[PDB]
Amino acid sequence: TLGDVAGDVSSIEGADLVATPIAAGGHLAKGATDAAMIAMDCSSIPFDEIKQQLNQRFNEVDKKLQKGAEALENVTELAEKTYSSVEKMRVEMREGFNHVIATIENANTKQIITGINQIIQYFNDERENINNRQKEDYVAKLQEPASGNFLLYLRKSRTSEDGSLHSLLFKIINQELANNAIRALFALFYGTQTFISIMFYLVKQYSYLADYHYQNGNLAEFNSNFDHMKTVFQDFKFTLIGINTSNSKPLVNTVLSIIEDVKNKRFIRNLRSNLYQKIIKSTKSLLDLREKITSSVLINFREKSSSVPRIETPILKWTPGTVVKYAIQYEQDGKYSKISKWSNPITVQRLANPYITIDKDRRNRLVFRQFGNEKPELISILDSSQNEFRDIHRDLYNAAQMPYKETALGICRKLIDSGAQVGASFEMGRKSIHASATAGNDDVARLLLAKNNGLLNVPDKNGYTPLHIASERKNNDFVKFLLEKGADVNVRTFANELTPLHLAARQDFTIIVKTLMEKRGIDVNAKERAGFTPLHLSITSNSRAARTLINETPAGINIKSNSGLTPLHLAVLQNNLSAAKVLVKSNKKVKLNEMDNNGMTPLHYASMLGNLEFVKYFTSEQGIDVNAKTKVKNWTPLHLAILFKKFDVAQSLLQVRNIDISTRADQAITPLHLAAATGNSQIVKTILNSGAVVDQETANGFTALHLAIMNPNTETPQFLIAKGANINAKTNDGSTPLHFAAALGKTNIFQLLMDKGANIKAENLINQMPIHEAVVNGHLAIVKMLIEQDSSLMNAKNMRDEYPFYLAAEKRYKDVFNYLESKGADVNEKNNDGNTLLHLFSINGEVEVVQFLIQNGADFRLRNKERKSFFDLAVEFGHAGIVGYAIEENKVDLQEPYRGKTILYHAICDSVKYDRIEVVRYFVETLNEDQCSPLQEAAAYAHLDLVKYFVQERGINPTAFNNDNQVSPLCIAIVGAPCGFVKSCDTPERLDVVEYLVDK
């Protein structure tokens, strides 16, 4: 919500301090209140993230060039639009791409996938790394040598070139037509999204640096950077719209074709694919826009010079002995084209009389002229013709800008006598009069008053009137002597409309605001773009400005601003005590409880910022409106003080005046819970000494006891014990704090709970025995005491088919496991209800806990209740790796006859029963086939995946031998004589392999 930031920085008053109230509104607009949030182990994260976003907003706003530097700001805004849209896509894609790490190592060559992941994260980190520097540091580090176009060099052609992985990856999705395919498809999808992000960001940053160094830096490398981003944009245009036959197909269109083939598959998958379908629209929009972009003008022009001998003037602003190098640029319909050349840079010892022999054109020409250094660099903005008049106009403008008024009057007289026509625009704006206003020169304007229409109301690029410009120049008497002409007094500027009264407030000019107020009866409480009065914009000046403006004239002392900010609010924020004092001493109709847009009063800001003197002054002086509920969910300043870990202010606010403790803040939150969350013994003891409730359960069913337990502090537990708190408590789930106490891992607090009658027998709606938590979190001592207390109740059953030793197992903590096994716990063969525990983990795809318990001495050769082998179970769900580690452990290589079955008879049956491709690939990794032809076994049930895989990993035809029409699986599948697997041939797999065999 950086738009709110812009609206609230329209008043330059307190940018960061007036950015804090949007964090306060986020506190007010987001449904934060719940026990996890109250623990504040979270709150710091969202608030720090909001502060970091605000820091990004500020350290990008301060880099921005104001207006009218080079017309390619249209290109820049096109950038920000399309770019930022790419991040609306990319932020949502990020949470999904976090999931792909779960299924790592399913392809042999996933190192390229992790390489692209680390590359994209590397530049995502660098974006914020560079994005927090200073202006000069920003430009220097974007000009940093030995890296330069580091991103361009990295993204040009690398060993991890996406074209190589592109074909094989589309083969992986072709497998998905029949998973790792989803994982790597989304890897490349995020890849192309971040590639378009790279392109937009790169062209944006080239544009920004071109503008930055084009503001009087140098036009030469400005044109160089112009060519640079033109080349980059057309390079991407070629890479994704290629008009070369001997070139790779565009990535975006091939991805699209994959999307149609996937939807043609008509199969189910994870919701990640659904997010992909949601992002399809964004991808196609980005495509269409990228081909519709092609921006700036594409051409340059040529011109010449000519010395006009009409008049001769001795001039010093036109410095003698300097070069007359000039150049022109194109500017039409809000676009620009840069050029840089002066074939005849001359150093004539004459006036500004040399005109330009510019060839006529249909495009408006901006003509600059150069001494050989950094100049205004804006002299003519013409359409058809001009004969050296622009140079005279530039001399007039810069002379007006000169502060030497005593000589400015003489030089302006001598130039206007020569015919220095006025009204021309400079720096793409009507300036000259405003340049004089900046310099504060008097006689120059008083003799230009011949053009009464101009000086009266001439606007600027942003509509800055000469009154607006002179209002921030300390030039009081000159404003006096130029005001008699009767200029408009409610006139404003174009963008971020402001009156000169509005703008004078920040610059602390009491004399100037006086000068304004004792002339006519001018409006004083006039608003502006964000709905602010000049009173609001004065307090940061922290001097006599506002103190004067309060009482010297009637004004908008209490006016509801559009942002909801009043002088009281600002005086609170920017920590201006004297302004608050003088505002209180006015004793006019200054309402104190005037709500803002958010819904919380200046006292609330004072508490949140944690300013002691403001709080006590507010509690003492006014004696009115010192504690009340807020607009939506009824906060108090004390609540804010507790939340933001400000203590001294908290007990000060308690001791200044009676503040009700029975308050009903959101979810009936009394500040006892908040104080417990902070964990300050003196604060909580003082609150209880104030007659506070001891065991008030909140609307979520939480009391301060649980939350205090989750706090690291250990004293307020005993404090709550002493102050009569129900030890046997019921949370939102009806849970008991023993669960949380064990979860955190405080042995001594747990012992105290046990001493005061806590009951281990307690549970929740899903009957969580505290042993479950005590083992999943993991610690020795809690287990020791609970055993010594009540024999673990033989580790009773949970909701799922779980025996607490199971959780202790997949936790894999050495000491507790050894303790449980030594003193008697669940063991592998006690799983008689179904198969054994080893036979049970492999069903749920266990990888490491099985191996670690085997090396923990657990037996291996047990036979399950279902006669079906542990190796076979490992094979059945893609876990033959455990069989391999059994081989290296030398458990047994199952080639010995089990009911006549050997290693080959164990590779056949399960790979027919289940489609574990990786297990077959591991079997062939342990290189052997034993003349097996699993293609024909698959075709016995006509499974196309396995027959295609055998074809691709062997190359032999699916029918190598011949017989009396019975050896071929095609005839077996089609004729289906003895009703064996015939009545269920309706499955398309029965005709799938038919074609892959007919084709050969």
Curated annotation (Swiss-Prot):
Locations listed in the record: Secreted; Target cell membrane
Keyword set includes Repeat: yes
Tissue: Expressed by the venom gland.
Entry GO MF terms: toxin activity
A single GO BP: exocytosis
Residue spans of the ANK repeats: 391-424, 428-458, 462-491, 496-526, 530-559, 563-592, 598-628, 633-663, 667-696, 700-729, 733-762, 766-795, 800-829, 833-862, 899-929, 930-960, 965-1000
Membrane-spanning residues: none
GO cellular component, as recorded: extracellular region; host cell presynaptic membrane; membrane; other organism cell membrane
Keyword vocabulary terms for this entry: ANK repeat, Cleavage on pair of basic residues, Exocytosis, Membrane, Neurotoxin, Presynaptic neurotoxin, Repeat, Secreted, Target cell membrane, Target membrane, Toxin, Transmembrane
Region feature Helix H8 is the probable transmembrane region of the tetrameric pore inserted in the target cell membrane, mapped onto this chain: 184-203
Function: Crustacean-selective presynaptic neurotoxin that induces neurotransmitter exocytosis. May bind to crustacean neurexin-1 homolog, adhesion G protein-coupled receptor L1 homolog, and receptor-type tyrosine-protein phosphatase S homolog, and induces neurotransmitter exocytosis both by forming tetrameric pores in membranes and signaling via G protein-coupled receptor. This recombinant protein form channels in artificial membrane bilayers, that are stabilized by calcium ions and allow calcium flux at negative membrane potentials.
The family this protein is said to belong to: Belongs to the cationic peptide 01 (latrotoxin) family. 01 (alpha-latrocrustotoxin) subfamily.
Assembly mode: Homotetramer in membranes.
Domain remarks in the Swiss-Prot or TrEMBL record: The H8 helix is predicted to insert into membranes and form pores by assembling into tetramers. The helix is contained within a helical bundle domain that undergoes significant conformational changes during pore formation to allow exposure of the H8 transmembrane helix and transition of the toxin from a soluble monomer to a transmembrane tetramer.
Name of the protein: Alpha-latrocrustotoxin-Lt1a
Organism whose genome encodes this protein: Latrodectus tredecimguttatus (Mediterranean black widow spider)
Species lineage: Eukaryota, Metazoa, Ecdysozoa, Arthropoda, Chelicerata
Covered residues, full protein: 48 to 1066 of 1413
